[PDB]
Amino acid sequence: MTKDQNGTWEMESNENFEGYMKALDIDFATRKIAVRLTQTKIIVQDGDNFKTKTNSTFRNYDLDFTVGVEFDEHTKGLDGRNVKTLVTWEGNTLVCVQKGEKENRGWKQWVEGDKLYLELTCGDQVCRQVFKKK
Ligand SMILES: CC1=C(/C=C/C(C)=C/C=C/C(C)=C/CO)C(C)(C)CCC1
Structure with a gap:
């Protein structure tokens, strides 16, 4: 297993805040909230x-x-x-x-490990997620 998905990564943020919003038009507050919101996540595959x-x-x-x-x-x-x-x-x-x-x-x-470059295409005008932690 040359990947070790099973990680933690307190999300930093997305780049095209507005394009991911569009991927599922929640609201305008949504994207501004997530913009700064450095949430936590943690995958784990077997x-x-x-x-x-x-x-x-x-x-x-x-x-x-x-x-x-x-x-x-x-x-x-x-x-x-x-x-x-x-x-x-x-x-x-x-x-x-x-x-x-x-x-x-x-x-x-x-x-990559400590850093991660999740790329959220999410509709045209591709967004770049920005992860970092584990
Ligand atoms: C916009 C938005 C959110 C972002 C959710 C996402 C995009 C989670 C990512 C999941 C993936 C892609 C996992 C693959 O490892 C959440 C609900 C969390 C907070 C407020 C609204």
């Missing part, structure tokens, strides 16, 4: 089965999806829309991309 959750005040969210075994998730709590996903390891990565009105809500959570 092979073909992983899970992670965010730790914010504003909103609580989670992905909890397998690795390539397509699944119709939901964004309940946040916006309340229906979605689907798909994940495939891509080096030290695990290319996820949402569906169900999304079609461009994917990430490039490739792990």
Whole structure:
């Protein structure tokens, strides 16, 4: 296992604050809140089965999806829309991309360690998540 996804990473923040907002138009306060909100997260995979959750005040969210075994998730709590996903390891990565009105809500959570450059495409005008910690 040359990846060790299973990590912690007190989220720093996203770059295109506004483009990720659009990925699921919560509200205008949403993006400004998350902009500065340095939340916590921590994934953990065992092979073909992983899970992670965010730790914010504003909103609580989670992905909890397998690795390539397509699944119709939901964004309940946040916006309340229906979605689907798909994940495939891509080096030290695990290319996820949402569906169900999304079609461009994917990430490039490739792990470096102490630093991390999750790239939140999330619709046109790609955003760059900015992680750092574990
Ligand atoms: C906008 C927004 C949030 C961001 C959620 C995300 C984007 C969590 C990331 C999950 C992923 C991509 C895990 C893959 O390892 C949360 C709910 C947390 C706080 C307020 C609103």
